[PDB]
Design a protein around this ligand. Structure first.
Ligand code: ZN
Ligand code: ZN
Lengths: 190, 49
């Protein structure tokens, strides 16, 4: 049995700028690639479990849990049309989403051989204030022997490559965006 | 890390794992995550946000 928890950096600021910069790559393409990868993970073995959490500026919401694709679409739609963005709190909170993922892997681990794994796709500036928190969620991931992988699209994260180095995960800095899925399916499919 | 408080029926779906309470952020937590936040993670998910 394997576990795949995809953490997508749905930072509305960065994605909005990316749509304004008129690059071919928008948030919709990223979500479609994520859904394709998750479908492959679920198909490889009918033991596997899937989880997709969106990391927003305010909250971290489980997009999941094909019926799965439909529920993901509706969830992200609601999350992006019903929002409250305070000006002060504009960064993305990677640490909170990782914490939610960890506590989810807790119960799922309790259910049982579950080999857990978290994939993070980041795009925007990673906040430095969460140093006390983010480090915590790395070590909590280390003690549970959960791997943390990183597909970073644009901006570099010293924090996330730190976390990949600690947990024993993979850090991929993809250059051109239309070639993302190929990488996603290749190196990040358990 | 502070301890947490619980009452069964009044005002399920947890804030952490989203499966069916902090005195600071007022976030409903189930038993599993209530133990994991204290024993392992050493910080509350609602306190981070
Ligand atoms: Zn819970
Ligand atoms: Zn709290």
């Amino acid at each position: 049995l394997n576990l795949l928890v995809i953490v997508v950096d749905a930072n509305p600021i960065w994605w909005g700028k990316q749509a304004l910069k008129e690059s071919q790559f928008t948030l919709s393409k990223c979500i479609d690639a994520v859904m394709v990868l998750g479908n492959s993970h679920l198909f490889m073995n009918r033991s596997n479990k899937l989880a997709v959490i969106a990391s927003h500026i305010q909250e971290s919401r489980f997009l999941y849990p094909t019926s799965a694709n439909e529920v993901i679409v509706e969830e992200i739609k609601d999350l992006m049309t019903k929002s409250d963005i305070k000006g002060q709190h504009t960064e993305t909170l990677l640490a909170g989403s990782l914490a939610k993922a960890l506590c989810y892997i807790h119960r799922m681990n309790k259910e049982v051989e579950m080999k857990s794994r978290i994939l993070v796709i980041k795009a925007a500036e990673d906040s430095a204030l969460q140093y006390m928190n983010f480090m915590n969620v790395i070590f909590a991931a280390q003690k549970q022997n959960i791997l943390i992988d990183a597909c970073v699209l644009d901006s570099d994260s010293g924090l996330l490559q730190q976390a990949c180095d600690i947990t024993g995960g993979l850090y991929l800095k993809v250059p051109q965006m239309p070639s993302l899925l190929q990488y996603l399916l290749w190196v990040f499919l358990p | 890390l502070d301890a947490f408080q619980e009452i069964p029926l009044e005002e399920r779906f947890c804030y952490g794992c989203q499966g069916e309470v902090c005195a600071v952020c007022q976030n409903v937590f189930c038993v599993d995550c209530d133990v994991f936040v204290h024993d392992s993670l050493h910080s509350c998910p609602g306190c981070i946000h």
